[PDB]
Motif scaffolding. Sequence first.
Motif, PDB file in Angstrom:
ATOM      1  N   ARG A 168       0.627  -1.381   0.094  1.00 57.96           N
ATOM      2  CA  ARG A 168       0.597  -0.004  -0.005  1.00 57.96           C
ATOM      3  C   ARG A 168       1.232   1.144   0.291  1.00 57.96           C
ATOM      4  N   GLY A 169       2.455   0.935   0.242  1.00 59.11           N
ATOM      5  CA  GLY A 169       3.016   1.908   0.339  1.00 59.11           C
ATOM      6  C   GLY A 169       2.616   2.888   1.658  1.00 59.11           C
ATOM      7  N   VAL A 170       4.317   2.975   2.377  1.00 58.00           N
ATOM      8  CA  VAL A 170       4.009   3.342   3.780  1.00 58.00           C
ATOM      9  C   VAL A 170       4.826   5.411   3.871  1.00 58.00           C
ATOM     10  N   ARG A 171       3.889   6.484   3.706  1.00 57.73           N
ATOM     11  CA  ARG A 171       4.749   7.478   3.371  1.00 57.73           C
ATOM     12  C   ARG A 171       5.531   7.459   5.322  1.00 57.73           C
ATOM     13  N   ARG A 172       7.580   7.316   4.822  1.00 53.56           N
ATOM     14  CA  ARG A 172       8.141   7.651   6.133  1.00 53.56           C
ATOM     15  C   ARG A 172       7.964   9.656   6.308  1.00 53.56           C
ATOM     16  N   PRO A 173       7.519  10.016   7.936  1.00 53.82           N
ATOM     17  CA  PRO A 173       8.059  11.299   8.576  1.00 53.82           C
ATOM     18  C   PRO A 173       9.082  12.009   7.198  1.00 53.82           C
ATOM     19  N   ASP A 174       9.481  11.632   6.795  1.00 53.79           N
ATOM     20  CA  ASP A 174      10.613  11.412   5.929  1.00 53.79           C
ATOM     21  C   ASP A 174      10.491  11.912   4.255  1.00 53.79           C
ATOM     22  N   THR A 193       4.211  23.705  -2.000  1.00 56.00           N
ATOM     23  CA  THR A 193       5.905  22.545  -1.923  1.00 56.00           C
ATOM     24  C   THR A 193       6.084  22.103  -0.759  1.00 56.00           C
ATOM     25  N   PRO A 194       6.617  22.117   0.070  1.00 57.99           N
ATOM     26  CA  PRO A 194       7.373  21.585   1.249  1.00 57.99           C
ATOM     27  C   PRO A 194       8.565  21.427   1.929  1.00 57.99           C
ATOM     28  N   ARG A 195       9.537  20.485   1.367  1.00 60.77           N
ATOM     29  CA  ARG A 195      10.602  20.589   1.309  1.00 60.77           C
ATOM     30  C   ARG A 195      11.640  21.070   2.876  1.00 60.77           C
ATOM     31  N   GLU A 196      12.362  19.834   3.187  1.00 61.91           N
ATOM     32  CA  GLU A 196      13.630  20.632   4.296  1.00 61.91           C
ATOM     33  C   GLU A 196      13.235  20.639   5.640  1.00 61.91           C
ATOM     34  N   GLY A 197      13.242  20.611   6.372  1.00 62.44           N
ATOM     35  CA  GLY A 197      12.857  21.380   7.711  1.00 62.44           C
ATOM     36  C   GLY A 197      13.712  20.335   8.488  1.00 62.44           C
ATOM     37  N   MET A 198      13.273  19.153   9.153  1.00 61.77           N
ATOM     38  CA  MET A 198      14.166  18.504   9.709  1.00 61.77           C
ATOM     39  C   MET A 198      12.682  16.710   9.026  1.00 61.77           C
ATOM     40  N   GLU A 199      12.110  17.041   9.461  1.00 63.42           N
ATOM     41  CA  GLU A 199      10.891  15.515   9.060  1.00 63.42           C
ATOM     42  C   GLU A 199      10.846  15.786   7.982  1.00 63.42           C
ATOM     43  N   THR A 200      10.923  17.007   7.759  1.00 65.79           N
ATOM     44  CA  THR A 200      10.025  17.424   6.215  1.00 65.79           C
ATOM     45  C   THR A 200       8.631  18.487   6.447  1.00 65.79           C
ATOM     46  N   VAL A 201       8.258  18.761   5.979  1.00 69.53           N
ATOM     47  CA  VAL A 201       7.230  19.600   6.297  1.00 69.53           C
ATOM     48  C   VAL A 201       6.471  20.781   4.542  1.00 69.53           C
ATOM     49  N   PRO A 202       5.090  20.493   4.435  1.00 68.60           N
ATOM     50  CA  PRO A 202       4.648  20.862   3.587  1.00 68.60           C
ATOM     51  C   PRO A 202       3.683  23.262   3.879  1.00 68.60           C
ATOM     52  N   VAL A 203       3.885  24.023   3.272  1.00 64.95           N
ATOM     53  CA  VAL A 203       3.888  24.706   3.438  1.00 64.95           C
ATOM     54  C   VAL A 203       2.937  25.414   2.186  1.00 64.95           C
ATOM     55  N   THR A 204       3.328  26.938   2.058  1.00 64.95           N
ATOM     56  CA  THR A 204       1.785  28.042   0.935  1.00 64.95           C
ATOM     57  C   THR A 204       3.704  29.166   1.022  1.00 64.95           C
ATOM     58  N   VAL A 205       3.339  29.841   0.064  1.00 65.23           N
ATOM     59  CA  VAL A 205       3.915  30.720  -0.437  1.00 65.23           C
ATOM     60  C   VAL A 205       2.703  32.045  -0.303  1.00 65.23           C
ATOM     61  N   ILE A 206       2.765  33.105   0.111  1.00 68.89           N
ATOM     62  CA  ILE A 206       1.931  34.122  -0.368  1.00 68.89           C
ATOM     63  C   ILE A 206       2.470  35.256   0.012  1.00 68.89           C
ATOM     64  N   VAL A 245      11.201  -5.705   7.011  1.00 69.27           N
ATOM     65  CA  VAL A 245      10.529  -5.123   7.650  1.00 69.27           C
ATOM     66  C   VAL A 245      10.072  -2.941   7.685  1.00 69.27           C
ATOM     67  N   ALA A 246       9.958  -2.739   8.973  1.00 67.74           N
ATOM     68  CA  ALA A 246      10.012  -1.460   8.850  1.00 67.74           C
ATOM     69  C   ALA A 246      10.379  -0.649   9.941  1.00 67.74           C
ATOM     70  N   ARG A 247      11.019   0.321  10.349  1.00 69.27           N
ATOM     71  CA  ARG A 247      11.553   0.843  11.669  1.00 69.27           C
ATOM     72  C   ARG A 247       9.899   0.416  12.227  1.00 69.27           C
ATOM     73  N   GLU A 248       8.781   1.187  11.924  1.00 69.10           N
ATOM     74  CA  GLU A 248       7.706   1.231  12.178  1.00 69.10           C
ATOM     75  C   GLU A 248       7.536   0.361  13.449  1.00 69.10           C
ATOM     76  N   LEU A 249       7.274  -1.073  13.444  1.00 71.75           N
ATOM     77  CA  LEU A 249       7.157  -1.884  14.922  1.00 71.75           C
ATOM     78  C   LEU A 249       7.780  -0.964  15.829  1.00 71.75           C
ATOM     79  N   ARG A 250       9.188  -1.069  16.112  1.00 66.28           N
ATOM     80  CA  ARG A 250       9.464  -0.181  17.393  1.00 66.28           C
ATOM     81  C   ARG A 250       8.026   0.914  17.664  1.00 66.28           C
ATOM     82  N   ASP A 251       8.609   1.350  16.514  1.00 69.94           N
ATOM     83  CA  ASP A 251       7.578   3.040  17.068  1.00 69.94           C
ATOM     84  C   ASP A 251       6.558   2.385  17.805  1.00 69.94           C
TER      85      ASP A 251
END
Lengths: 52, 122, 105, 191, 58
Positions: free
Chosen positions: B67-73, D12-25, B102-108
């Motif tokens: 299903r594809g998991v979007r990593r906070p990364d 568009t999002p990009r960067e941060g530390m985990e990453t995050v999407p926003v918007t320009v104004i 598997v994936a980090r997940e689990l741990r989390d």
Amino acid sequence: RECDYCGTDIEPGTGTMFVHKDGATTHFCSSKCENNADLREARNLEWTDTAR
Amino acid sequence: MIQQESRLKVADNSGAREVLVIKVLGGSGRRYANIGDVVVATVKDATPGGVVKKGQVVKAVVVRTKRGVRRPDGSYIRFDENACVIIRDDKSPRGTRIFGPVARELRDKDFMKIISLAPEVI
Amino acid sequence: SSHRLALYRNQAKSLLTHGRITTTVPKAKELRGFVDHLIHLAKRGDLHARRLVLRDLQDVKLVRKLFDEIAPRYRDRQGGYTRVLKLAERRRGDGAPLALVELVE
Amino acid sequence: VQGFAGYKAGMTPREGMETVPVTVIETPPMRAVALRAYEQRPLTEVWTDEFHSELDRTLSDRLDHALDIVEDGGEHAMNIFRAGEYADVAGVTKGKGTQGPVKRWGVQKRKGKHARQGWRRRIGNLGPWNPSRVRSTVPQQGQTGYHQRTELNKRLIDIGEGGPYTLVKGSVPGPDKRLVPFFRAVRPNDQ
Amino acid sequence: AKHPVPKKKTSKSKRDMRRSHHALTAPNLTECPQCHGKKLSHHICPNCGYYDGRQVLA
RNA sequence: CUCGAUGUCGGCUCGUCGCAUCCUGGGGCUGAAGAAGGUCCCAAGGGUUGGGCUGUUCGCCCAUUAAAGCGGCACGCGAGCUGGGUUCAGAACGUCGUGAGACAGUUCGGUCUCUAUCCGCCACGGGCGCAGGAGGCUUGAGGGGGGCUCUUCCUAGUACGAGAGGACCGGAAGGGACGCACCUCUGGUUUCCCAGCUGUCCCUCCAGGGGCAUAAGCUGGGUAGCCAUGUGCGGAAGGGAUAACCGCUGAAAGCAUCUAAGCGGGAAGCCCGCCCCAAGAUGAGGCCUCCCACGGCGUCAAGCCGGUAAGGACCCGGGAAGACCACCCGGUGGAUGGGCCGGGGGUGUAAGCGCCGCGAGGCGUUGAGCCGACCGGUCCCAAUCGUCCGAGGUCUUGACC
């Protein structure tokens, strides 16, 4: 690597990596790699970082 | 992802093979079993009576879903397959051993147990 | 689809021949750009170019005729080689505000 | 003008530390037109012409600090909105139009065995027999795309000038880039 | 298959009233470029050919 | 009442009330320590899940959950489906009948009809109005939206506790269903954008193409917009008036009493607050920024004409603005369409010549070629020129210059 092999490539300074069973793998790329590769024998693969 | 009666193999050895997905575990509503998640399904079939046995009321978790998991990364990960592991009420596996990564997940969401047993955790 | 084209087709065709026909508002508004576009190719002028232009129009005589013939009379400008002019009247029963268009000259 | 506002840059999002999407104004200081007060009598909006050059082609903090920039000469650079903040913006829906009770309004349609029957889209019902004709209840194909939409918990992350512009935490400005954006951090909860 | 049909003689009155919101509005036409006369605001004609270029007849 | 006819079961959808409240808060009670239950008073906000087998509801069973509510409205809904079913003729069994037929016993299958007029609802324009004629900006009385929740952690394993356990009170985090909005990331689109293909007709023979093979013939792929499987976010604080419910100060009952009077406590609840309209709320609201008294006619001529680009319009050119309409920006002192041009995106290195192999092909030139809307330049093209309508400043009273 080389999209595992798929020497093509696709999707930003992130991309993504598919995967199979047995601790085996499949880092990945484009809709030209996928499908094809996901269904036969890599060796035979051309276009890309194989039959280069 | 993975509910009603979508099927998924084993990677541990519990003595299984594949399992039907009854409920997504958590609380009312809820409609989804995504690795880390925990499922309320049963045996679609299991080895020659290892210890489990075909058609056995069960409890398993999430670790492999195409299903594809979007990593906070802002990253992305998925698999050629969809299956997981059984468990002892105490979010504790049975299969003595693992299989596909598997994936980090689990741990989390708790499980180390497998986290390491795993041949490779991606 | 196959019809959008067809049109552009014969219209593009006929036109180049005369260089200003009589189709309704839109019809024209488009036969322009396209046909137009095409032009810009007669301008490019060569193996390729021609192998396209024709590709659609299909027909030495013209195809060539324009590439050589007109093309030049245009080699200079910047697109627009067409001046889509609306018309005063309207086809009957209908009541459609036709219109005429030509190769700006 | 009590507030602060401008238009949609884009997302568009990009960067941060985990990453995050926003918007320009987009929006420097769209000048300062009078200011809100109902003193000695009814007072609200004056106009001591000092505007653009075209505009006659058509010719207490928030508002307060204003006095600061609205008397300066007119304009007033935007951005107190600083590093990690929650204003709120009210976009303009989106010329989406008149649609079926489908998306317009969540609802299940023509099922299976009849979830096709050259059948399909179309609500289920209105009112019973005895009850009475109709309600002003059940919506209808209540057009959309024009609504004066907006929202809440609108957190701004950062900003910079090169062109006075703002970076946002999750876009959903409602309306489209080049669109009319107004922001605020109203009765914030994250405060 | 006439599920729904009027139910009460429509009332001339109203009826027409209906037919009421209707109405025309003469062509906004202007006057010749040099053609001298009245043309379809924006166009040459059986009086023109002009505009700026003689693209017509007569 | 209806047989000059109200189409009946269950289902579907769309729901809407109600409270005797299932979940949810607030309470008093307990044979209640904890924790969890039981009892009953107050509150409907919000909410109250997937399957199974059954035409069914009901119901039993499976896995959840806080919870998996009782009932209204023709046991809501057929001019909105369903149409299994009971309820047309078939025909079956069984079953009674000399029989004919037959049955709330059963069993197979058995024609639910395109054009809403009114009232009604959702929506968008047209008036006419709000008494100068004017474009821009706001107030909101009053309406509408939304309010739910699980779990995890410290406080704490401290109160309680023989123990196995487990707090009010006070505070973090995650997640579930849900809704508003939105493309960035993700995924679905992508009727021609790009590429490979077999059959055929024209093409001139080869090459290089062309329709058709649906409306694209087939397959791989594919921006931009829309759109989820995906992005932000939300249901909160807090303020005021209460339920139940708890108290204080103290009569009449010189002793007590939340009590009539006096003052406070206390709810997912009402009012407010948070978003969403919105004065056509005929009580037409505010405010700023423009326009100035034109003509001649018998009159309280508040009636007929040039006007004031203040100003607007119409016609043109354009818009995630859009059925029409209304609504927004532009109208060559323009960048509004297209065009071109750079730029990105997309398809995978072209047409040709070249060089290897009898051929098939390959390798090169060549990340080529070709490019549908995405970002932005440039007056090539096409928004020329023109019309029309529009004010003047109604009567009384007074307050100030």
